[PDB]
Amino acid sequence: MNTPKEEFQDWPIVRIAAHLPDLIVYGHFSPERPFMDYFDGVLMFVDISGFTAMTEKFSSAMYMDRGAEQLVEILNYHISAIVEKVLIFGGDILKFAGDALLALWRVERKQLKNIITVVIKCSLEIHGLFETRVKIGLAAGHISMLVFGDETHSHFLVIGQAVDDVRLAQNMAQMNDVILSPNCWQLCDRSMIEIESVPDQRAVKVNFLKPPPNFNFDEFFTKCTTFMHYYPSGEHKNLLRLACTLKPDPELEMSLQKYVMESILKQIDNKQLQGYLSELRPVTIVFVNLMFEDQDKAEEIGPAIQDAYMHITSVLKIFQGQINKVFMFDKGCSFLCVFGFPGEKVPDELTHALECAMDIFDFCSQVHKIQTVSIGVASGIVFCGIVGHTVRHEYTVIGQKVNLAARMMMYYPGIVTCDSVTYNGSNLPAYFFKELPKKVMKGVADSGPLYQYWGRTEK
């Protein structure tokens, strides 16, 4: 009696799970919104802006109309390597957002110390990939999770001091650096490492991982796997993710698909070509920032984000805008919204982005606990595609206009701002805008004139 090999692990549910972290895939939580949960862990933030900066290189005519294809190929080659390191070291890639990868090692509190060592080693091996670059911030401590959305769509955020800390840490780093948050440094095993102080900060820089003379990392890591719920093991020790082993389960797939864009699900269902979403396309970015007095307290900010989300989604529906990403910044929550800019009725479409931005601004400004709303609007060619590893990847939009809208919302807080392409293209009367002072914006290559969208009336 024969014993044929299994092969089939390519079900729709498995394909969907590539686009999500274990936090969600194995989360099994209520479908009430907002939903909040609380745990501890170690966070890694890998700035890959040095890679995403290649949108400019691949815009050249030299690439003969295959710039998007070449860009996705070379990005996925390098990012895949980073992903594999994270996954092999036991981490959960949470999101590809803000030209960074955010990863989590969720553990009980007593194990933070040893898991930090695992994460430092991982960080150093990541840098080791690109010798002949990236910046890494590490944090540890209390983490909160927020899931928000409606009956068809779901999003999540992780929130809290450790989340604030991990982006602050990475922001202090130079290329090739690993920076620890103050709490990470307080919680770590100091015998493992040599650090130096970072001027005007309580964060530290890892100079070396130099363990004690009898230390054996492989045996240490094996001990640490006791605390890693989903580390692939036994029969499945050859897999990068346990999620590769998911079987059909209609209830679970119904819940997981809500996190994934419909055009992605179309590809997953083999109803559109696998390369259709890798493209340089003209869009309008509407980047919405919501600031809160207490950005670490899920209990306060979670209802506000849910209420904002319900309104945002309703306004986007009217114009098939999409939410590409939601992620945290230092004082609040950012929504990266995307509109088609096909240019079949240029004044009409850019007018719509602007009107949607103002609607969102007006509504979110009256949501309890939202202290400041800021919206940046930029229009132009952007790279779109599914970026990451076969087993862990996400649809992403990258480019100078994404970065411009992001910076506008931070350097011109409390208002709706637009670039020159958007202003000019709208054909709206000029008195609906205000020409703004020029600001030198970190990371922005000469913005052109910027404008406030003042709106229809003098007021």
Swiss-Prot record:
Effect of residue 95 to A: Nearly abolishes bicarbonate-mediated increase of enzyme activity. Abolishes bicarbonate-mediated increase of enzyme activity
Domain annotation Guanylate cyclase: ranges: 42-170, 284-409
Top-level taxon of origin: Eukaryota
PTM remark: Cleavage may occur to generate the active 48 kDa form.
Location(s) in or outside the cell: Cell membrane; Cytoplasm, Cytoskeleton; Cytoplasm, Perinuclear region; Nucleus
Binding locations of hydrogencarbonate: 95, 158, 167, 328
Residue positions binding Mg(2+) 1: 47, 99
Binding residues for Mg(2+) 2: 47-48, 99
Disulfide pairings: none
Tissue distribution: Detected in airway epithelial cells and testis (at protein level). Weakly expressed in multiple tissues. Expressed in brain, heart, kidney, liver, lung, pancreas, peripheral blood leukocytes, placenta, skeletal muscle, stomach, thymus, airway epithelial cells, duodenum, jejunum and ileum. Very low level of expression in bone.
Binding locations of ATP: 47-52, 99, 135, 397, 403-407
Implicated disorder: Hypercalciuria absorptive 2: A common type of hypercalciuria, a condition characterized by excessive urinary calcium excretion. Absorptive hypercalciuria is due to gastrointestinal hyperabsorption of calcium and is a frequent cause of calcium oxalate nephrolithiasis.
Family: Belongs to the adenylyl cyclase class-4/guanylyl cyclase family.
Function: Catalyzes the formation of the signaling molecule cAMP. May function as sensor that mediates responses to changes in cellular bicarbonate and CO(2) levels. Has a critical role in mammalian spermatogenesis by producing the cAMP which regulates cAMP-responsive nuclear factors indispensable for sperm maturation in the epididymis. Induces capacitation, the maturational process that sperm undergo prior to fertilization. Involved in ciliary beat regulation.
Written domain comment of the UniProt record: The N-terminal guanylate cyclase domains are required for enzyme activity. Fragments or isoforms containing the first 470 amino acid residues are fully active.
Annotated protein name in UniProt: Adenylate cyclase type 10
Organism: Homo sapiens
